[PDB]
Design an enzyme around this catalytic site. Structure first.
Site, PDB file in Angstrom:
ATOM      1  N   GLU A  98       4.849   5.447  -2.621  1.00 25.83           N
ATOM      2  CA  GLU A  98       4.530   4.033  -2.460  1.00 25.83           C
ATOM      3  C   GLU A  98       5.184   2.972  -3.339  1.00 25.83           C
ATOM      4  OE1 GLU A  98       0.363   3.421  -2.075  1.00 25.83           O
ATOM      5  OE2 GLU A  98       0.349   1.469  -3.076  1.00 25.83           O
ATOM      6  N   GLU A 130      -8.470   3.148   0.733  1.00 27.43           N
ATOM      7  CA  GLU A 130      -8.260   3.381  -0.690  1.00 27.43           C
ATOM      8  C   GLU A 130      -9.391   2.912  -1.589  1.00 27.43           C
ATOM      9  OE1 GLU A 130      -5.275   0.862  -2.638  1.00 27.43           O
ATOM     10  OE2 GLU A 130      -4.910   2.452  -4.106  1.00 27.43           O
TER      11      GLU A 130
END
Ligand SMILES: O=C(O)[C@H](O)C[C@@H](O)CCCO
Ligand SMILES: C[C@H](O)[C@H](O)C[C@@H](O)C(=O)O
Ligand SMILES: [Mg+2]
Ligand SMILES: [Mg+2]
EC number: 4.2.1.90
Lengths: 402, 402
Positions: B249, B346
């Protein structure tokens, strides 16, 4: 060898803006008073709303005001610069960036610049407010460095590549600008997509009128301040082709790179498409350049500073593109006079009716040069740093300290 | 027909930040104290500098603090939201945006959103600080609207498409997260390009270790927080392929769209490349999506708000891409539970050592839901608006008024 002092203090002030005196002018081009051409029914992304169609000030184009950054060396010598950010800009400088500035050598300009970009990447948005602040610090540092060394910034950069800078004027009176000696006149569009064919007809008529009054060789341009879409911009461009409009500027919001690529492809043969005054960071300009537009127009005080502007110039030059900065007064002058690919520059009329040569950043800059007969001779720029002093007479406010 | 009140007042407060109490937590995830995993030698664009390698707080990742926006209706009902912007965020809300908010119907959310974007386009930079502020206002408006109507935001949006939200945890202890019931664990990289092959070896070893401890089905991901370049990211991705790293990421700064396209092409087969938490505005996400990355991760409080997040979800869905927002607690929960293309979410560990389920925005939100056994049942979100109240016990500061 020359001995260089370290940076001792960095301080930020502001004038104008929502928390000071409205119409302060200075760094914030749009912080003007009433009956100013720069606020006269200018097309914007907000003019589609009746309450915000007549005035940009009404939607808040003047809330930020002027940011003033001054860096002081250990030997008490100072350098400064101004830009658009105001009070919030002061917060950023006094509460965050100071840690990268103070203690550095006055020559550590590129290092400080990289640290400011790296440390603010999580909230800078790669442009706008935060980048304006970073740019102001960068310019103040160059100013201090040049003043410490005793050389104008343009000589530190590698000297002028032309003896004088020729200007085109931005305002409602291209005809008056021609009389003043400018090489061209850029007018703002007053209508937008919501106005359809009538809007196109009206702004095109405005150009037609000035073409008749100014002659064939005096350049004419249209500034669209992010207010259109690809179809409207295409129609307007073609409606102005008969009058040899030199270029149509910033038709779209900054993130619309794909739209700019399409607009440039749709443009009338020979007519240029430009943008860039609201873009920031070298990487954004790489993306902008690849859309194929003819001229990128970063504002030295908004794009990231002189350090970034010089990189953008190289980027454009490598592609055969031109770089013609947005306003910026001396901050642009010292840079562009050294750019082979900046054959002319811009002077944004701060005069309410575009009849006089009121200084670009009036009145925050003392002894601010103005084009005389549409030009600024390089000798005029032959002073340490950016060659100007801070007008301490203005009501500078210091909202933060550290 | 239901009668709706008009918006009477909008107010902004802040906690934490450079002008308040350091380590206030709340909206600013990084405004933590000492010995916190989230500040433990995390790789960043600044860690190449020795003075800023060990701590992100050292370069100022915590200067902004928490912005709190509260909108009050004529009937005295209120709605609010929090984000990262602090004092400067307050300036923007109280000195500029209030003019578009007050006087509107509580249902005029999309109108107010468009006006905020249009009015700040000249200084928003399409992301970061200004967009965080706009997002906070947007969320406060949705909260107020839902509380006035008496419905949770997720029902106003069209209902949940799943009975519970499953989470992966971000922090230094994927192993402890597996025990807590999470479906995966995302770790931050600690080394960067300047560390070369040794840096790659070390972060890859870190992943290898957690793979051994967590098993094959528990997901493992690496967060690179804009700290790499294409070559380094490519090497790290391939060095982690043997351990089936699910995704790597935000390897690059947000403006590097071209780099992301190249990185995605270079990625190991089946390994995903993601980014987006620092991007803002729908148009930026259009450009991001076209780079081909697998998952865009806007933060609801930074990308432009819920109004923008819903559009980003549609954009991703039209392309078969997934949208997995960055943290955001309830502001993300109410949106993603209604997104067919947000199969998981998340939870960013605010616990200093990632051993407990300290609330995502602790302690600014009262009754803030936390995943239990790695999940949040939709019934938990069955409350008006975003279902939480402002912790007025915190030392909220009101720097501006109007
Ligand atoms: O290029 C420039 O000097 C600016 O964009 C001029 C702008 O402030 C006026 C609005 C034109 O539509
Ligand atoms: C630990 C990392 O540096 C970030 O703070 C986490 C953030 O990027 C996320 O995706 O949760
Ligand atoms: Mg312009
Ligand atoms: Mg991340």
């Amino acid at each position: 060898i020359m001995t260089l002092p370290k940076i001792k203090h960095v301080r930020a002030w502001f004038i104008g803006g929502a928390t000071a005196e409205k119409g302060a002018g200075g760094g914030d081009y749009h912080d003007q008073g009433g009956n100013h051409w720069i606020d006269d029914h200018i097309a914007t992304p907000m003019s589609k709303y009746r309450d915000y169609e007549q005035s940009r000030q009404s939607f808040g184009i003047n809330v930020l005001g002027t940011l003033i950054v001054e860096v002081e060396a250990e030997n008490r010598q100072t350098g400064f610069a101004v830009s658009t950010a105001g009070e919030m800009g002061c917060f950023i400088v006094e509460k965050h960036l100071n840690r990268f500035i103070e203690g550095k050598c006055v020559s550590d300009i590129k290092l400080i610049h990289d640290q400011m970009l790296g440390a603010t990447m999580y909230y800078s948005g790669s442009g706008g407010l935060v980048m304006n602040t970073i740019s102001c610090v960068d310019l103040a540092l160059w100013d201090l460095f040049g003043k410490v060394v005793g050389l104008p910034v343009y000589k530190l950069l590698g000297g002028a590549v032309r003896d004088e800078i020729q200007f085109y004027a931005t305002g409602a009176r291209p005809d008056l600008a021609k009389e003043m000696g400018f090489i061209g006149g850029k007018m703002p569009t007053h209508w937008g997509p919501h106005d359809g064919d009538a809007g196109i007809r009206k702004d095109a008529a405005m150009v037609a009128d000035m073409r008749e009054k100014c002659g064939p060789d005096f350049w004419l341009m249209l500034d669209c301040w992010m207010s259109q879409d690809v179809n409207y911009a295409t129609k307007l461009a073609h409606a102005c082709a008969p009058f040899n409009l030199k270029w149509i500027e910033e038709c779209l919001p900054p993130q619309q790179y794909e739209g700019y690529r399409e607009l440039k492809r749709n443009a009338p043969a020979g007519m240029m498409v430009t943008s860039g005054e609201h873009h920031g960071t070298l990487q954004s300009f790489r993306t902008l350049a690849e859309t194929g537009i003819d001229i990128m127009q970063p504002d030295v005080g908004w794009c990231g500073g002189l350090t970034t502007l010089v990189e953008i110039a190289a980027l454009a030059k490598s592609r055969g593109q031109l770089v013609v900065p947005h306003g910026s007064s001396v901050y642009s002058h010292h840079a562009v006079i050294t750019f082979t690919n900046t054959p002319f520059s811009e002077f944004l009329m701060t005069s309410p009716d575009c009849s006089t040569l009121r200084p670009q950043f009036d009145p925050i800059l003392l002894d601010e040069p103005v084009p005389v007969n549409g030009r600024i001779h390089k000798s005029v720029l032959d002073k340490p740093g950016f060659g100007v002093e801070l007008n301490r007479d203005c009501h500078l406010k210091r909202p933060y300290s550290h």
